[PDB]
Amino acid sequence: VRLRKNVCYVVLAVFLSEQDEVLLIQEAKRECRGSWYLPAGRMEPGETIVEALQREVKEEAGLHCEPETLLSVEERGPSWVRFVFLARPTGGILKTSKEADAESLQAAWYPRTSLPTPLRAHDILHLVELAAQYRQQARHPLIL
Template sequence: MKRGKVWLAVAGLVIDEDGKWLVVKKKYSGLKGMWSLPAGFVNAGETVDEAVIREVKEETGLHTTIKGIIGVRSGVIQNDISDNMMIFLLENKGISSIEKEEAELWDVQWKSPQELLADEKTSVMVHEMIKRMSSMQKLNLIEGINPGDQFAYTQYRLFL
């Protein structure tokens, strides 16, 4: 899929009842071989919240629901490509058996924040998220709002 020079991606943080984080090791990209959150690009015709639920399911097999947005990562690659990611807090809907996406991932595991901090193969973003967990706030999903028919939205959501 042609992405152009403005990229929009999503990542999902799922924390189990024991406080362990769902992390993946990708087989490609700048995060190859590193523990990171399940993530991927938003496709045409989907909202960011639909995209993160799809990506987590594709990579891990888990069915999740949105708890809120907990962060945004934004950067520019080689002074050219705007690379943006919305980071969601998700809740696992109870199915705990992981189904790894073999084509994309080396591994999928539940790891404690302490394990992730001690592992040199943990991504910088995950390290920074763990350090700030106690002060992390979330923006909640608000549905059922119509901003006006003149915009012709087929879907519209706010996170506040």
């Protein structure tokens, strides 16, 4: 729970439902306004990694969640790190266009196979595939 001063630590949530839908958010940030991404943001000092994840999901999408696995850990140089969790919903209220504000314009569930446009960046396509693969394996355990 101690963070280095000149390091940026990011958490990102991939939700992939039993109906093969992904939870996306429509960015209110001026630097990518109206583009679509996954719930994500920067860890704050004093929070655990999973507390950060839950806060960002709640702020951006309105939902309560729990992590199911860590799907990917990425660095971009030594001063940027991202923890990409698979998460699942455990309560809260989906934050729709009714609540449009500076945290997010809306949150919405889209078919993994028919994602909205424009996407903020195309790295989440791979992160979503990781989730699809984990879900596939979980439903096909292959016990003889």
